[PDB]
Amino acid sequence: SLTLTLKETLLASPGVLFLDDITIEKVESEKNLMILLPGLEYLVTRDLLRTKFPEYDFTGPENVRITVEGYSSLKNAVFEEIGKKAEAKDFEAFVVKTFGTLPEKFEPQTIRVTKISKNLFSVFLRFPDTYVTLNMLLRKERNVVVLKRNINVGDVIKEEDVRLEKRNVFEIYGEPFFDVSEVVGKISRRYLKEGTVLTADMVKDPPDVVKGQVVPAYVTTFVEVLENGYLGETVRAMNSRKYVFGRVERGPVLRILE
């Protein structure tokens, strides 16, 4: 019907949020969009707007970000609870849907959190007078190590291969790296293309001995390694002449078995 331009952000107070609050033009509307609770952050999405007002189109920013004024006790108690059910710490959470009524007082009796899907939790609040459910999207935005260029199986990562980029860690499959210093010296297990967020499962540590390396050995001599090897591994070797089984030991020396 109408194309309403969305505000980028809104500072609010506890109560009921209406469409007029998040649009640049004046609209009259009496329908409850969100239940605004003190100290919590809200994100009004297009999917919310398509549900509530399917008859209108919307332009502007992807989401409207709403900060509600108030003491931080409810927030704290909610965040502590999400932390326990989610497994996570140091995260941001945004309410993207609410159900229930605006309570008279904002001191919850009970706080119950259940997983809806990936990164989405239903935070149920019991108040002496009523109930609020907040559907909260979890975000952990951090600087991660991303490839500047294509790399192959067996390539050593160097500082020139990688840059740092801000990403949502909760939308990365695998454990990312937060420092170039964590990945330099590592050996790629795969052919990766530029733009690939580096994760722990794609790289391996450098070997403690390499194939062809000269190391001291105990049976009182130096040997030449037939394979790459890590500490504790038994690597085949040669030396003047013969075949020897030898474990990589702290050193790195080989210890020739028997």
Closest CA to 88 of 136, 138, 43: 138
Domain residue ranges in the chain: 1-139, 140-207, 208-258
- Beta partners for 73? none
Torsion of CA 241, 247, 251, 252, to 10 degrees: 60
User: Distance between CA 104 and CA 123 in Å, rounded?
Assistant: 18
Q: How is domain 1-139 classified at the CATH fold level? A: Thiol Ester Dehydrase; Chain A (3.10.129)
Q: How open is the CA angle 186-188-190, to the nearest 5 degrees? A: 165
Q: How open is the CA angle 211-215-217, to the nearest 5 degrees? A: 120
Region at 77 (left for phi over 0; alpha for psi -120 to 50; beta for the rest): alpha
Closest CA to 45 of 97, 99, 123: 97
- Beta partners for 156? 187
Exposure letters 178-189 (e unless 16+ CB within 10 A, then b): eebebbbebbbe
Task: List helix spans (H) across the chain.
Answer: 46-52, 73-86, 180-183
- Beta partners for 236? 245
Residue 63: is it exposed, middle or buried by C-beta count within 10 angstroms (0-12/13-18/19+)? buried
Q: Is the dihedral of CA 10, 13, 14, 16 positive or negative?
A: negative
Q: How open is the CA angle 62-66-71, to the nearest 5 degrees? A: 155
User: Distance between CA 6 and CA 24 in Å, rounded?
Assistant: 6
User: Is 140-207 assigned to CATH 3.40.50.410?
Assistant: no
User: Distance between CA 237 and CA 205 in Å, rounded?
Assistant: 22
Classify residue 209 by its DSSP letter: B
User: Distance between CA 6 and CA 235 in Å, rounded?
Assistant: 65
Say how many C-beta atoms besides its own lie within 10 A of residue 147's C-beta. Answer: 19
User: Distance between CA 110 and CA 107 in Å, rounded?
Assistant: 9
User: Distance between CA 82 and CA 140 in Å, rounded?
Assistant: 13
89 in Cβ contact with 83 (< 8 Å):
yes
User: Distance between CA 81 and CA 41 in Å, rounded?
Assistant: 16
Gap sites in the chain (C to N > 2.5 Å), preceding residue numbers: 219, 239
Give the SS3 label for residue 179: coil
CATH of domain 208-258: 2.30.30.760
Q: State both tokens at 168.
A: 């949502």
